[PDB]
Amino acid sequence: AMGSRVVILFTDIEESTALNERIGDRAWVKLISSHDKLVSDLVRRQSGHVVKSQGDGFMVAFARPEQAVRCGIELQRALRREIRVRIGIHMGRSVRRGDDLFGRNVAMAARVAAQAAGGEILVSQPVRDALSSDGIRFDDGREVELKGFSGTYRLFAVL
């Protein structure tokens, strides 16, 4: 993998299209505007940078894995206080192109988030291995196949 080491976090609201259809566009745009503000504030708290939005989810860059995980922990807490979000985190080298990130580790991060349940923070093995002392605990992981990748990958939920 090429480029600089970065931690990439993806959020994704569960079943947001059905929600949009149920409440209508007026209520949806109000909901997502508030969600954007929330995510943006919590990202900034852990020194992250939002790269882009898919409307109901964000791609976010952090320098350190504990920053990303803490952001995720705070987001889940805030949401608990109705939408559910899945969060995936991976780290590794990726290529900076403009203000965007490219490469297999970006795709890997997206695939990890896709595996996450609503309300769950899932991290890849390298993220798990990099943490411990940081006030963060994990489960024992689950091995899964990821589309586009040849391996099987053990993904760890934050407890």
Ligand X SMILES: C[C@H]1O[C@@H](n2cnc3c(N)ncnc32)C[C@@H]1OP(=O)(O)OP(=O)(O)OP(=O)(O)O
Q: Nearer Cβ to Ca ion, position 122 or 136?
A: 122
The correct pick among 9, 39, 43, 59 for binding ligand X (CB under 6 A) is 59
If one asks whether residue 40 binds a copy of itself (CB under 8 A), the answer comes out as no
Would you list the DSSP string of 41-103? HHHHHTT-EEEEE-SS-EEEEESSHHHHHHHHHHHHHHHH----EEEEEEEEEEEEETTEEES
Q: How far is the CB of 125 from a copy of itself (least distance, A)?
A: 17
Candidates 140, 147, 152, 159: give the one binding a copy of itself (CB under 8 A). 147
| Number of neighbouring beta carbons within 10 Å of residue 3 | 16
Binding residue per annotation — 115? yes
Q: Is 56 marked as binding a ligand?
A: yes
Question: How far is Cα 158 from Cα 70, in angstroms, rounded to an integer?
Answer: 10
- Smallest distance, Å, CB 85 to a copy of itself? 16
Task: List binding-site positions.
Answer: 12-13, 56, 111, 115, 146, 149
